[PDB]
Amino acid sequence: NLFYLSPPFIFRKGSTHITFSKETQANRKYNLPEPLSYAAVGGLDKEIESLKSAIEIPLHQPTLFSSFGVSPPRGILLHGPPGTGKTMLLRVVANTSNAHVLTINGPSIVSKYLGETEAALRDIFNEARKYQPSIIFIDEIDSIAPNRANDDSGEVESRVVATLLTLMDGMGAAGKVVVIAATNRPNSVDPALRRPGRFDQEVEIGIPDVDARFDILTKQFSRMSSDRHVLDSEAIKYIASKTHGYVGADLTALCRESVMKTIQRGLGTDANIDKFSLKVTLKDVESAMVDIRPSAMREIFLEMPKVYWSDIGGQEELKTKMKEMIQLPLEASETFARLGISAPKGVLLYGPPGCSKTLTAKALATESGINFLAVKGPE
Amino acid sequence: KFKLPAEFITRPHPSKDHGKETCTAYIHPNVLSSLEINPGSFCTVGKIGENGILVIARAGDEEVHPVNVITLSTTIRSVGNLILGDRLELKKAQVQPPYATKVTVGSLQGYNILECMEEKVIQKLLDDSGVIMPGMIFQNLKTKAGDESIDVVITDASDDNLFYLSPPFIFRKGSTHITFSKETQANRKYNLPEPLSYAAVGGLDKEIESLKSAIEIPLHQPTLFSSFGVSPPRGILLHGPPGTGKTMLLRVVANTSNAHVLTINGPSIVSKYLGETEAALRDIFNEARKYQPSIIFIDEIDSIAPNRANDDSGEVESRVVATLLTLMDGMGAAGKVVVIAATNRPNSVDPALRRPGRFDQEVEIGIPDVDARFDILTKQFSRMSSDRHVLDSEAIKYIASKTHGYVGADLTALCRESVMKTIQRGLGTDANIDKFSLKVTLKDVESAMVDIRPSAMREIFLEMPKVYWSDIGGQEELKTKMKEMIQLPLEASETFARLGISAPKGVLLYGPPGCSKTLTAKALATESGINFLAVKGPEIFNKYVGESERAIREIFRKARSAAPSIIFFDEIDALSPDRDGSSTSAANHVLTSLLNEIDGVEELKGVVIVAATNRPDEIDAALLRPGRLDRHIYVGPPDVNARLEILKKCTKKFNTEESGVDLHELADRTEGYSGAEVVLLCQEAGLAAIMEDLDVAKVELRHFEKAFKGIARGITPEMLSYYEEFALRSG
Amino acid sequence: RPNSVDPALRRPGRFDQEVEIGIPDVDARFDILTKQFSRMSSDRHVLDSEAIKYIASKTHGYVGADLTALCRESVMKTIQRGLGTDANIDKFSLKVTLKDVESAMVDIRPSAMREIFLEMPKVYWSDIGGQEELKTKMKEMIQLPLEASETFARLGISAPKGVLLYGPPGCSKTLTAKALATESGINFLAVKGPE
Ligand SMILES: Nc1ncnc2c1ncn2[C@@H]1O[C@H](COP(=O)(O)OP(=O)(O)OP(O)(O)=S)[C@@H](O)[C@H]1O
Ligand SMILES: Nc1ncnc2c1ncn2[C@@H]1O[C@H](COP(=O)(O)OP(=O)(O)OP(O)(O)=S)[C@@H](O)[C@H]1O
Ligand SMILES: Nc1ncnc2c1ncn2[C@@H]1O[C@H](COP(=O)(O)OP(=O)(O)OP(O)(O)=S)[C@@H](O)[C@H]1O
Ligand SMILES: Nc1ncnc2c1ncn2[C@@H]1O[C@H](COP(=O)(O)OP(=O)(O)OP(O)(O)=S)[C@@H](O)[C@H]1O
Ligand SMILES: Nc1ncnc2c1ncn2[C@@H]1O[C@H](COP(=O)(O)OP(=O)(O)OP(O)(O)=S)[C@@H](O)[C@H]1O
């Protein structure tokens, strides 16, 4: 009657047929945990190889540095805006590397009794020393190791930061141990904790480029079945160029919302329709994208009633020049790049009240595709 | 019933210089019996959490040995680098280790000891051990000359990795063979712990003499003070910026000083119960007093002893501080105990601890200068010693000259990153090269400098392009004057020291919009070599009463740390009203902080201040004085040659050499243009060419004429008259 | 911290009498130094008893433990002087010359003065060309009231304890502050404006 993660069976030669297959993974029926791998991470290629180097040499080839008379780099810190995939990197590092894996999940170690938070850290680092090689993860380091000089950091923060400092570089030794940390606020981490010897490397993990977003979208859509209908490159490339300022969590939300839109369309067609054949068509992605907001833009509220160029009566000169400024440098990038010329990046629209000044700004906002931040004089 | 302790304490053999004892661990017979380790059997000893050494048990006098103490000679203690007072885990050996054929007798003083010594006694000294391993040292063996002594090392043994730190071997006499060498260290593939020594510390000669004076006499020569009737000292407080060598000095003192060593690593003693933190301190000090001479180390003493008047310091903190005070200087005497504490924040340690009898000396471990840095780099590159090709002492001196602001940890990181550049170079030529066979050339140190910023500069995120002095057209006088300040003081330092004069520390760049001011800031940030800080005008201001001044003080602090350094004050007039009666209190206090921090009661040594302004007559006189903003340099609209250089640089990727346009005619045409207007002319011309077609070939004179017709001259004779009548003062 | 103790304990019948062990003045300093130099009594040579009054007169801010540190560092300085003259001179045979106490005073700053971290390179009254009236008036306040204390007590006057230095930028106002820090002898604190 017991409950198992996988059914137990016994092999009895001859009487149990060893039937071959080509499926490279276990049967999907079972909900077996499936290893996360680097192939699921998009972009960040150079950062991924930097993580590989700084994880591999300290743990799996230390005698190379001992041969060269230098200490090993026992620290990596990942910083960059939220949603860029910092915890994804920590989980893939955990699941890929063969090492003792320990985690300080910020507030998970914290206690209201005087010395217990510090004792949790000492036990974690002594376990890492005991079993080698070892990787210690600290997601949101800034939650347990604040600046220690600012006003709100009292004695408790001082003692926790001191424990981290002394367990990384103090009278005690390290061993084949590497500490990997992630933070959205690198400068809120204590300044004496980022010196070489502690978090020597600061592998920045920033917002994706157009190439990075294309990579993330191809890898996200590779997870699905043959119900995509988005041409592996072209449609995904259009979606990647149309996403500006996206970070990667929002792109996953966009894919999930596209699935939601396709299946709600299916329900609106008929309740008993054969959904699985309802390919997510690019218009479903479009309907999804209008219902998501870029990570860097949730707080940019706009009423923006979707102005288009044809609404502006005349002003053909202004329209041509604003096409020059906003559209062309992206639609003809290689030409400007090869001429060594950066397009003009500022314009002043001046004229009597009630002309097309603000309306042209709104038209740029809702025709250029790029983001659009607005300001007013006395606000 | 007898209770078995969980942790034993190392202590020294009192008995003898040498003998068969050299592998015997005397233990309390209660413990020996309880563990069934009868005398003569094989037992293992090791630091907690680590593999163990193999030794021979013996029983100690019941009335002298406490239960905790295990007694070991220097020979065995050298193997695992066991410092007296280290906590041991003792265990019985399940299996007798095998026999080796090779005994690799090394030397520490490096002589041909077989000539300096009679090997017929060396054989006895090697034989007596019974067990043999890599690492065992033998000490103070008198030479044939008698007046001198030698030390010996067993570097390795083998026969022709888990549960054992050093591979244990048994001395099967006759099958064992000597393989003598001058080598001083064990095979690094074993990965034994390498003892620390003072020779690994550089740039702290005076501080090292101070610590040695304040440790040796109080511990190993107390009768000297008693003869004079002065009480011995009890403390040293090492302090200084993070990364300067404090904990390294504590580790070296622990390794080299022949005293019982106890440690308090930050709040390692802080406990949830009401009186356990005080009990821990009292236990530590009673142990120190029981096993004199002893040293009690306290890292992060600002974390177990705050100021006790600070708001956050409650009763727990008060009780701990009181315990320290009473244990160091109270009604009971502490004996021959020296407390060496390291702290990055000396003023957070309670004032009562910082007075004679508690912390007599406070030794500052400061940021290394050029020579201290040369020492550090020499010592590390000597720790390399074959894989370098960085040699002749000039390349390391060059690196010391180039790595400004480095603190000592950054230098270790530089060596490591240079090694990694070597590894990836080797991969760059052979994807399977032998990484143990490479060498780290000066190219690699230079290639690592570009990825290591000083720890002082970590907070200063300035994402700037790469602007060269070749980008700035004209401004030759400005370039010469800026070189005189930025690079000459560092290249011609000896000449300045000889003439007795230091270079001026400030320049005010003033001129009309669009002429080279901030561009020179970027050029310095790229070409200067010395560290660059920048404040973008009113960036510092804050609604609160005392924060806008703290921003100034903090930026100047960060510049002091990273000296030599450049601070660029962009549009400084935002910070410096004229004090003619304006009621803007925050601006006036910012101005006063800036004044008193450029040239005030404390001098500003290595920082050079650059400030750019559009409206230079609005700046205060006290700021423009010599000593703060020494020399005023006018950056005006480019002349014909400067325009022409701008055009040649900007129009390079226009295939102008084909036909149509002629840059000299243009340079003459654009009189009165700011440089930005010339750049705009080129940009708009390229844009018009793109409009006539998406070619990549060439622009035409039609495009330049069209662009010229659009750009208006933003600089007027009133502006130039203003700037020239300001300049008229200099004469 | 007398006020940190509960008032109920600071009541007659529980803590009847409170005794204030204050900071020693010149006479207390001299008594302390006489007794700490009496325990030495033969390795000393400082015994003129005018040398000890001299030292006491220059030990500004010394609280009583600083004087012990002073004697100890004097022993160390004479030790290292002996080693400098001869490589293996018997350290037990040396004597503590007055020069040794003077050379120790350059290292021991009072415990009350240990929170004040001021860099302040050396500057001397000879570096400040001119300003002779200023130098005379600064001496009249910083040194005469300590050199001529008994005369002031006889005439019944206290010297003025404030001076406002004013003038155009670039003259020796802050330079005089650095000169005072280097050459006044007495302790130096500084507040840098809106700090
Ligand atoms: N290539 C990718 N880059 C980034 N995020 C991805 C990527 N692929 C999937 N994701 C999803 O985006 C999220 C990335 O993890 P997050 O933890 O949200 O990132 P993070 O916010 O930087 O880490 P935190 O703040 O410590 S939770 C997860 O929900 C992933 O499922
Ligand atoms: N070609 C046009 N010229 C002027 N107004 C136009 C034009 N086309 C449409 N409009 C309308 O006229 C009004 C002008 O509004 P705005 O574009 O805000 O003018 P405005 O000059 O920006 O006014 P301000 O900013 O308050 S001075 C809006 O209702 C527009 O929809
Ligand atoms: N010759 C040297 N001189 C000084 N420092 C050195 C030298 N060689 C290496 N170092 C580095 O200096 C550092 C010594 O650490 P410390 O500066 O004492 O630590 P800290 O950040 O100041 O605070 P704590 O409490 O002492 S860990 C280590 O990172 C060493 O690698
Ligand atoms: N030789 C040159 N001289 C001046 N400006 C140049 C030159 N070459 C390029 N520029 C352009 O000049 C622009 C303005 O740079 P700066 O001269 O630093 O402006 P500025 O002098 O600081 O004027 P203010 O005081 O900020 S309004 C840059 O964006 C460059 O593109
Ligand atoms: N005899 C002297 N008189 C005046 N200044 C001198 C003299 N000798 C050298 N100086 C220089 O003059 C500078 C003036 O320094 P400060 O005392 O800071 O001036 P200041 O009186 O404080 O003016 P302000 O109000 O601070 S701008 C010193 O830093 C020296 O470099």
Side-chain angles (χ1 to χ4, degrees):
Chain A
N1 182 57
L2 281 73
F3 298 87
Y4 304 130
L5 174 47
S6 190
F9 292 116
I10 301 171
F11 184 97
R12 324 171 61 81
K13 193 177 178 184
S15 65
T16 183
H17 275 140
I18 307 178
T19 56
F20 285 5
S21 298
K22 300 308 309 293
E23 310 192 82
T24 56
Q25 288 69 240
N27 191 327
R28 204 51 60 191
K29 291 177 70 68
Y30 292 114
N31 295 332
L32 294 174
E34 211 56 11
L36 294 174
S37 176
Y38 286 136
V41 185
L44 308 157
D45 262 4
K46 186 58 59 174
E47 288 68 31
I48 277 168
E49 280 100 14
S50 199
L51 283 199
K52 294 213 181 123
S53 178
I55 287 158
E56 183 178 1
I57 302 293
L59 299 187
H60 297 139
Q61 188 72 322
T63 56
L64 180 60
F65 291 166
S66 181
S67 181
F68 270 93
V70 298
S71 66
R74 62 191 309 285
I76 321 182
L77 181 150
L78 293 155
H79 69 290
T84 55
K86 307 195 304 316
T87 305
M88 207 51 170
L89 286 186
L90 300 191
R91 192 166 287 279
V92 301
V93 168
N95 194 177
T96 304
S97 188
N98 274 305
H100 213 64
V101 165
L102 303 176
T103 185
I104 296 153
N105 187 25
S108 72
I109 60 157
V110 176
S111 166
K112 65 176 175 176
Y113 298 104
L114 188 77
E116 185 169 36
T117 306
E118 301 94 310
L121 292 165
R122 292 190 293 262
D123 172 351
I124 287 165
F125 279 77
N126 298 346
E127 182 177 340
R129 184 201 271 121
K130 195 149 191 313
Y131 314 115
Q132 284 180 26
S134 298
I135 299 160
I136 307 175
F137 293 116
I138 322 183
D139 194 29
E140 296 291 77
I141 187 66
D142 57 322
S143 66
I144 59 161
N147 199 331
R148 184 167 61 131
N150 63 6
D151 300 344
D152 63 358
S153 294
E155 292 302 327
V156 179
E157 293 82 3
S158 183
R159 287 198 308 263
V160 178
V161 176
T163 302
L164 270 164
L165 294 171
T166 53
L167 292 164
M168 282 187 104
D169 181 23
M171 296 274 278
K176 293 181 181 180
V177 179
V178 67
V179 184
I180 306 183
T183 176
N184 298 285
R185 302 180 301 177
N187 279 340
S188 306
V189 186
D190 174 274
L193 183 63
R194 260 183 303 160
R195 64 174 260 287
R198 302 186 160 128
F199 284 103
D200 312 15
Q201 309 213 327
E202 289 182 280
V203 178
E204 201 202 319
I205 176 157
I207 67 177
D209 297 332
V210 58
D211 295 340
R213 273 193 312 297
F214 172 58
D215 200 4
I216 297 162
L217 283 156
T218 71
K219 284 177 187 196
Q220 268 304 119
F221 272 110
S222 87
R223 301 275 71 78
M224 313 181 47
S225 190
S226 186
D227 300 341
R228 289 155 72 168
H229 186 273
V230 298
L231 177 56
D232 286 6
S233 298
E234 188 53 81
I236 289 157
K237 195 133 61 178
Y238 162 93
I239 297 169
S241 51
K242 176 190 179 262
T243 47
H244 276 136
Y246 273 74
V247 293
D250 46 14
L251 290 174
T252 306
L254 171 57
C255 295
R256 194 178 207 132
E257 180 58 26
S258 301
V259 173
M260 294 299 291
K261 286 271 159 52
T262 298
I263 304 156
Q264 73 85 53
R265 169 168 71 78
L267 284 166
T269 305
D270 210 347
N272 70 346
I273 198 161
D274 199 13
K275 289 182 170 65
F276 82 85
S277 309
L278 297 176
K279 324 312 201 153
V280 65
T281 175
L282 187 150
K283 61 162 58 71
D284 288 317
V285 185
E286 294 294 328
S287 307
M289 184 176 177
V290 176
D291 211 355
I292 178 164
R293 195 66 189 286
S295 182
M297 294 295 291
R298 281 75 178 272
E299 66 269 50
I300 300 294
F301 308 103
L302 299 170
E303 66 278 17
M304 185 63 72
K306 313 303 195 292
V307 180
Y308 303 83
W309 292 115
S310 55
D311 306 334
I312 296 98
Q315 309 291 355
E316 182 65 26
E317 301 76 60
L318 169 72
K319 289 171 182 172
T320 42
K321 296 158 144 298
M322 301 270 272
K323 293 182 183 292
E324 270 286 350
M325 287 177 31
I326 303 300
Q327 276 191 292
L328 176 67
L330 303 178
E331 326 188 344
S333 171
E334 62 268 26
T335 318
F336 290 88
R338 283 171 299 179
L339 295 183
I341 301 299
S342 298
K345 67 179 172 72
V347 65
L348 183 61
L349 308 176
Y350 65 101
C355 306
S356 70
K357 321 204 280 292
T358 314
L359 185 61
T360 315
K362 294 212 91 53
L364 277 182
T366 49
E367 190 277 331
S368 300
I370 63 171
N371 302 308
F372 170 92
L373 287 63
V375 176
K376 182 67 180 294
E379 67 179 0
Chain B
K1 292 185 181 181
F2 177 86
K3 184 169 181 179
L4 181 79
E7 293 179 353
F8 298 74
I9 294 164
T10 47
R11 290 296 295 156
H13 291 187
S15 51
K16 210 173 183 295
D17 192 63
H18 276 87
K20 62 188 301 185
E21 305 169 282
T22 45
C23 192
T24 64
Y26 309 164
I27 302 142
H28 203 316
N30 294 355
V31 177
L32 284 185
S33 57
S34 177
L35 291 175
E36 304 190 355
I37 307 172
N38 290 318
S41 64
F42 296 109
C43 54
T44 61
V45 172
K47 284 175 68 175
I48 296 168
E50 298 188 34
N51 303 295
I53 301 299
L54 185 140
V55 291
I56 296 164
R58 302 294 170 165
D61 185 354
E62 293 83 3
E63 305 210 56
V64 177
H65 270 65
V67 285
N68 297 90
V69 175
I70 300 181
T71 72
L72 298 168
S73 75
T74 61
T75 306
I76 310 93
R77 276 214 308 293
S78 73
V79 182
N81 200 33
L82 292 173
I83 294 93
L84 293 186
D86 291 331
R87 294 271 181 300
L88 300 181
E89 176 208 63
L90 169 63
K91 296 183 293 206
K92 189 169 180 180
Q94 294 203 344
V95 184
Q96 190 171 357
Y99 314 113
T101 48
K102 179 174 176 178
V103 180
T104 317
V105 187
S107 303
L108 288 148
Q109 294 189 30
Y111 316 138
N112 286 5
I113 295 175
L114 304 178
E115 304 182 44
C116 307
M117 299 198 113
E118 177 165 40
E119 198 212 324
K120 294 190 176 173
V121 185
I122 302 179
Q123 292 164 8
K124 192 176 179 180
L125 295 179
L126 291 165
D127 176 1
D128 296 353
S129 72
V131 180
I132 284 187
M133 294 182 286
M136 299 156 190
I137 193 181
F138 296 71
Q139 207 166 7
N140 302 317
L141 312 177
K142 289 179 178 175
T143 57
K144 282 185 180 189
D147 301 343
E148 300 188 336
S149 67
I150 283 164
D151 302 338
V152 169
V153 168
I154 296 185
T155 58
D156 182 19
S158 65
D159 181 11
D160 292 299
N161 296 310
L162 288 89
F163 320 116
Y164 295 86
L165 179 66
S166 64
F169 296 105
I170 294 192
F171 180 70
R172 194 170 180 163
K173 197 172 181 171
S175 74
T176 54
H177 299 283
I178 283 172
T179 45
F180 182 76
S181 167
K182 300 178 180 177
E183 286 154 298
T184 57
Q185 193 214 340
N187 188 358
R188 290 189 180 193
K189 299 184 179 179
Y190 293 149
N191 203 45
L192 300 185
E194 311 91 341
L196 275 289
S197 70
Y198 279 116
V201 188
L204 300 173
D205 295 309
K206 298 287 99 174
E207 289 83 350
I208 282 168
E209 311 326 330
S210 184
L211 282 72
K212 284 193 299 190
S213 183
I215 295 162
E216 190 277 331
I217 300 173
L219 288 189
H220 308 125
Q221 213 174 10
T223 53
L224 178 75
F225 288 132
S226 88
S227 302
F228 283 87
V230 289
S231 66
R234 197 154 310 293
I236 307 169
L237 188 70
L238 293 68
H239 73 257
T244 47
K246 310 182 277 283
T247 296
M248 184 177 177
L249 277 170
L250 301 199
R251 290 197 302 154
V252 177
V253 173
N255 274 254
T256 69
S257 315
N258 179 28
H260 188 288
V261 173
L262 294 174
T263 56
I264 299 169
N265 287 295
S268 176
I269 48 162
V270 177
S271 174
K272 73 174 74 74
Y273 299 118
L274 177 57
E276 281 295 331
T277 311
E278 302 95 314
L281 274 162
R282 289 192 290 267
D283 183 5
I284 285 164
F285 274 89
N286 293 57
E287 193 173 329
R289 169 158 69 69
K290 185 178 164 68
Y291 301 126
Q292 297 171 58
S294 63
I295 305 174
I296 310 162
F297 289 113
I298 318 186
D299 291 331
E300 294 293 328
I301 187 156
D302 47 21
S303 83
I304 66 170
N307 204 317
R308 196 166 51 136
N310 284 7
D311 308 302
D312 303 290
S313 178
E315 271 55 40
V316 172
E317 291 77 10
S318 163
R319 294 199 290 260
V320 175
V321 178
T323 301
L324 272 162
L325 298 172
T326 55
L327 289 170
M328 293 212 259
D329 202 27
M331 301 195 68
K336 310 200 304 174
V337 182
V338 180
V339 189
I340 303 175
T343 187
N344 175 26
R345 303 141 80 228
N347 282 351
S348 297
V349 183
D350 187 283
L353 284 165
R354 307 172 71 199
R355 63 84 160 168
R358 296 212 172 104
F359 282 116
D360 295 330
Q361 293 214 240
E362 303 196 0
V363 177
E364 183 178 1
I365 308 314
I367 303 191
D369 63 358
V370 181
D371 303 308
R373 185 179 296 113
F374 183 20
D375 291 331
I376 292 160
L377 288 162
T378 297
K379 285 161 161 58
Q380 273 144 0
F381 278 116
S382 169
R383 185 179 67 189
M384 282 199 197
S385 51
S386 165
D387 293 339
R388 275 183 287 176
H389 300 211
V390 176
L391 290 175
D392 302 335
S393 176
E394 294 294 328
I396 292 169
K397 186 183 286 185
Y398 172 89
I399 297 152
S401 305
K402 287 281 190 277
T403 61
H404 289 126
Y406 277 49
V407 70
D410 315 330
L411 295 168
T412 313
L414 188 82
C415 298
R416 169 175 42 252
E417 294 293 328
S418 57
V419 167
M420 267 159 39
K421 302 295 181 176
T422 303
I423 280 162
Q424 63 84 30
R425 176 160 69 62
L427 294 174
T429 66
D430 173 6
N432 297 290
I433 196 154
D434 187 4
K435 280 174 293 197
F436 283 70
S437 70
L438 296 173
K439 310 286 202 88
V440 60
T441 61
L442 185 55
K443 297 296 188 176
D444 269 25
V445 191
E446 289 179 316
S447 300
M449 281 198 277
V450 298
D451 288 343
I452 308 194
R453 274 166 58 132
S455 69
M457 291 305 266
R458 284 288 222 287
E459 284 105 339
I460 293 167
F461 288 117
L462 291 193
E463 168 49 72
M464 293 199 186
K466 294 276 282 187
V467 173
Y468 304 89
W469 289 120
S470 314
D471 303 348
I472 302 191
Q475 311 301 13
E476 292 299 322
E477 183 178 1
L478 173 83
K479 289 170 194 177
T480 301
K481 276 180 169 266
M482 284 284 207
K483 290 270 191 172
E484 284 181 352
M485 311 210 320
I486 300 299
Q487 184 177 2
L488 195 66
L490 282 71
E491 289 193 355
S493 182
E494 61 264 35
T495 314
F496 287 116
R498 187 152 44 81
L499 288 190
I501 52 159
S502 180
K505 312 290 185 167
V507 293
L508 187 90
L509 310 180
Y510 68 85
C515 303
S516 300
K517 284 168 280 306
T518 311
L519 197 75
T520 290
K522 300 170 191 173
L524 289 171
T526 305
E527 294 293 328
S528 62
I530 62 170
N531 301 296
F532 184 83
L533 298 92
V535 65
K536 280 152 272 310
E539 181 186 300
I540 67 180
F541 279 106
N542 192 304
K543 57 182 286 192
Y544 289 133
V545 176
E547 294 281 44
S548 66
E549 307 93 351
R550 185 170 287 103
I552 298 287
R553 300 196 298 261
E554 182 62 20
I555 193 66
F556 273 98
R557 184 181 81 51
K558 279 184 294 201
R560 290 187 187 272
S561 179
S565 173
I566 298 150
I567 304 188
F568 191 81
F569 288 98
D570 207 9
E571 293 179 353
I572 186 67
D573 50 60
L575 283 73
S576 69
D578 202 16
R579 298 168 83 177
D580 62 345
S582 188
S583 60
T584 312
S585 293
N588 204 27
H589 294 179
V590 170
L591 171 60
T592 308
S593 306
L594 187 64
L595 287 180
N596 290 354
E597 182 65 26
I598 298 164
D599 171 0
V601 68
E602 293 179 353
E603 206 165 335
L604 186 68
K605 294 308 310 190
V607 184
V608 65
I609 302 302
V610 183
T613 180
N614 213 358
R615 292 183 291 113
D617 79 14
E618 286 300 285
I619 295 169
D620 198 336
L623 195 67
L624 305 176
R625 185 193 39 109
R628 299 197 172 108
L629 297 181
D630 291 288
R631 64 211 321 191
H632 292 171
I633 304 169
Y634 179 42
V635 289
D639 65 27
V640 182
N641 292 307
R643 260 162 309 178
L644 178 53
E645 294 301 354
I646 298 164
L647 289 165
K648 292 181 181 179
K649 188 276 194 161
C650 202
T651 67
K652 188 153 43 48
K653 276 190 185 80
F654 305 160
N655 192 354
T656 187
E657 299 94 301
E658 283 277 32
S659 60
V661 299
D662 174 25
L663 308 184
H664 312 327
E665 294 294 328
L666 271 53
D668 307 295
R669 204 201 291 251
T670 55
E671 182 65 26
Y673 273 39
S674 71
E677 283 145 41
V678 181
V679 172
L680 184 65
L681 185 72
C682 297
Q683 283 176 0
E684 296 215 311
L687 186 143
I690 297 169
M691 270 305 107
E692 284 202 8
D693 193 5
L694 282 72
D695 73 6
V696 190
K698 72 182 300 297
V699 306
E700 299 199 318
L701 187 61
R702 305 171 300 102
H703 301 147
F704 291 164
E705 190 277 331
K706 178 185 292 288
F708 191 89
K709 186 165 313 288
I711 297 169
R713 287 203 252 281
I715 297 175
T716 76
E718 301 96 330
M719 268 171 178
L720 299 181
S721 180
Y722 181 76
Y723 295 112
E724 280 294 14
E725 61 86 20
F726 191 107
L728 183 63
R729 297 178 182 183
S730 304
Chain C
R1 324 201 281 141
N3 278 6
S4 185
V5 181
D6 186 307
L9 285 166
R10 303 173 69 192
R11 180 192 73 92
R14 292 174 169 130
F15 280 124
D16 293 290
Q17 183 165 195
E18 302 195 10
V19 189
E20 198 188 356
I21 306 305
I23 295 184
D25 60 9
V26 185
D27 291 331
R29 293 179 182 176
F30 172 84
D31 202 8
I32 296 162
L33 289 165
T34 294
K35 289 164 180 306
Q36 304 199 222
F37 277 122
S38 179
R39 290 200 310 267
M40 207 175 287
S41 66
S42 84
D43 283 319
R44 194 151 50 61
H45 166 238
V46 182
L47 72 166
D48 290 334
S49 182
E50 293 145 280
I52 296 158
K53 215 186 297 183
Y54 188 94
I55 293 151
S57 82
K58 293 187 287 185
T59 54
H60 296 121
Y62 273 55
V63 65
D66 310 330
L67 302 163
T68 300
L70 187 69
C71 301
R72 178 174 58 230
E73 281 313 322
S74 310
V75 181
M76 311 275 268
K77 292 286 187 281
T78 194
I79 282 160
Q80 89 181 19
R81 187 163 54 70
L83 282 71
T85 63
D86 309 76
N88 295 295
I89 187 151
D90 193 58
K91 296 156 77 176
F92 295 77
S93 168
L94 292 151
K95 293 197 180 186
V96 178
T97 316
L98 171 63
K99 300 294 187 291
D100 303 328
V101 176
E102 288 190 9
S103 300
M105 270 198 268
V106 174
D107 297 351
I108 297 89
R109 59 188 284 172
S111 300
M113 187 66 204
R114 194 171 291 210
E115 305 253 12
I116 305 301
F117 279 98
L118 285 167
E119 184 56 25
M120 298 217 283
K122 304 289 204 65
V123 175
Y124 300 94
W125 287 119
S126 66
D127 299 336
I128 308 183
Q131 313 294 352
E132 182 68 357
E133 291 184 351
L134 172 58
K135 298 176 190 166
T136 306
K137 292 181 181 180
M138 295 302 321
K139 294 181 176 67
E140 287 181 2
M141 301 206 317
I142 305 309
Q143 273 154 30
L144 195 82
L146 300 184
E147 178 58 24
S149 179
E150 215 182 9
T151 309
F152 278 87
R154 181 167 67 237
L155 289 169
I157 60 168
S158 301
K161 64 179 161 69
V163 55
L164 185 87
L165 305 176
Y166 71 85
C171 313
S172 67
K173 303 188 280 291
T174 301
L175 195 67
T176 293
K178 306 198 280 192
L180 286 161
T182 297
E183 195 152 13
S184 63
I186 62 170
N187 304 140
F188 187 90
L189 295 90
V191 166
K192 284 162 71 213
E195 184 179 33

